[PDB]
Design a protein around this ligand. Sequence first.
Ligand SMILES: Nc1ncnc2c1ncn2[C@@H]1O[C@H](COP(=O)(O)OP(=O)(O)O)[C@@H](O)[C@H]1O
Length: 157
Amino acid sequence: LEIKLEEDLTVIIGNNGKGKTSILYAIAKTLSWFVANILKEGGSGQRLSEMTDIKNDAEDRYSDVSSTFFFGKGLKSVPIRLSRSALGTAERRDSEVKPAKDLADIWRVINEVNTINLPTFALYNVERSQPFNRNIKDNTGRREERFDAYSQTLGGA
DNA sequence: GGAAGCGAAAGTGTCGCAACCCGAGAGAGGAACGATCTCGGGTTGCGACACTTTCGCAACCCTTAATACGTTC
RNA sequence: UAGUCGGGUGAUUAGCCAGACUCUAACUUAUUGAACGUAUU
Ligand SMILES: Nc1ncnc2c1ncn2[C@@H]1O[C@H](COP(=O)(O)OP(=O)(O)O)[C@@H](O)[C@H]1O
């Protein structure tokens, strides 16, 4: 499947069990690498599940999620591919996440040398709408500091 | 293909809390014996969370290259 | 309207001017090797 995401707003519609949540999940997994390498040099983002994400029928028992990002005329393409092979497969497929690491390295290094505006990556899935608020004191890393905005940003809730 | 570090993802154990049970005990009433509410352990079920295991990113570039100037794979 | 093509001007990778295109839809890449162009030859 291929999609042509719009620059400002894209709406995905369909019946139940058509793959809209799957598309959002794949995009969030792709953005996790950008978030991780912004927070942490050479950081590891999320990866495709080897138990559920690969198509049940399949022909090669592996799945790929290719994404291309635009960052102006100076960087017209940032290709990142997430790949995973199914359980019990001799040949394992690797992911091509280097350009995302390079772009996030640019962001992080420039920001530390001189403060810049950082991009926002958020996922609001069905795990939202959970009851209650402020369940625990949540000793988690000083919400005041700037890089706390990337904590659990693509978790769904 | 995959050091060395490290973190994601998934599975499993554990451990504390709640909920209840059960015997002991001082003693309400009203004229005695012991109702009834509480104290102190003890057991079980459960779920959040810690702990455990596996995978995968991607150093280096091996003895072993050539060195007019440009695109392309 | 975008976006794209690129003829001109421009101390010139920028800015501007004229013109044109639109399958749902480019993202310019890699050497010393191979071939191509060019220069010595
Ligand atoms: N690994 C898989 N192989 C084949 N079909 C799958 C797999 N995982 C999910 N599906 C199917 O694809 C659909 C996934 O649903 P989902 O992506 O949440 O769609 P939506 O948000 O449109 O309801 C369901 O119909 C599910 O049965």
